[PDB]
Amino acid sequence: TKYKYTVEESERFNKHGIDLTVYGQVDPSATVVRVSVERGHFQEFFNVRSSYTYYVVSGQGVFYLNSEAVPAGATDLITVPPNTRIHYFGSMEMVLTVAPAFNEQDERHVRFISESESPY
Numbered sequence: 663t664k665y666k667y668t669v670e671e672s673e674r675f676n677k678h679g680i681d682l683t684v685y686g687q688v689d690p691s692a693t694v695v696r697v698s699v700e701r702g703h704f705q706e707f708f709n710v711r712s713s714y715t716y717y718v719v720s721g722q723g724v725f726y727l728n729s730e731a732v733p734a735g736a737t738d739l740i741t742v743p744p745n746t747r748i749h750y751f752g753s754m755e756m757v758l759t760v761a762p763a764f765n766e767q768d769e770r771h772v773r774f775i776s777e778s779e780s781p782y
Contacts, residue, residue: 664687667685667686667687668685669683669685669696671685671686672684672685672686673686678703678704678705679699679701679703679704679705679777680697680698680702681699682695682696682697683695683696683697683698688763689763690762690763691761691762691763692759692760692761692762692763693759693760693761694757694758694759695757695758695760695764696755696756696757696758697754697755697757697758698754698755698756699723699750699752699753699754699756700753701751701752701753701780701782702723702749702750702751702775702777702779702780702782703748703750703751703775704749704774704775704777704779704780705749705771705772705773705774706726706747706748706749706771706772706773706774706775707748707749707769707771707772708744708745708746708747708748708769708770708772709744709745709764709770710768710770711744711762711765711768712744712761712762712763712764712765712768713741713742713743713744713759713760713761714742714746714758714759715739715740715742715758715759715761716739716742716757716758716759717738717739717757717758718734718735718736718737718738718740718754719754719755719756719757720754720755721735721752721753721754722734722735722736722752722753722754723735723750723752723753723754723782724750724751724752725740725742725748725750726747726748726749726750727742727748728746728747734750734754747772749775751779751781751782752780752782753782
């Protein structure tokens with residue numbers, strides 16, 4: 663059994679202004695990924711099946727959850743139910759849990775967000 667996954671062996675890419683680290687573990691109950699963000703996630707989306715739970719390792723930002731501003735800082739936990747519109751601005755390092763496991767078929771695009779809208 664493979665228990666340990668490393669950053670060296672992960673898939674690392676930029677998506678809508680964030681840097682994602684996808685470790686490549688397979689577990690139907692949850693997908694855990696790393697997110698690094700310099701200014702924002704410049705796209706609003708929702709997921710019809712999975713909750714999105716962000717742990718803020720470091721930094722400061724603001725989530726927009728169904729257009730409601732939710733400030734976030736280091737050590738905060740942001741828990742987003744399924745079918746909730748999400749975007750965010752900030753300079754932050756985060757651990758993101760998607761539960762149950764992320765499936766691209768469950769994701770929906772709402773709108774792009776102008777890069778000038780981030781105060782970071």
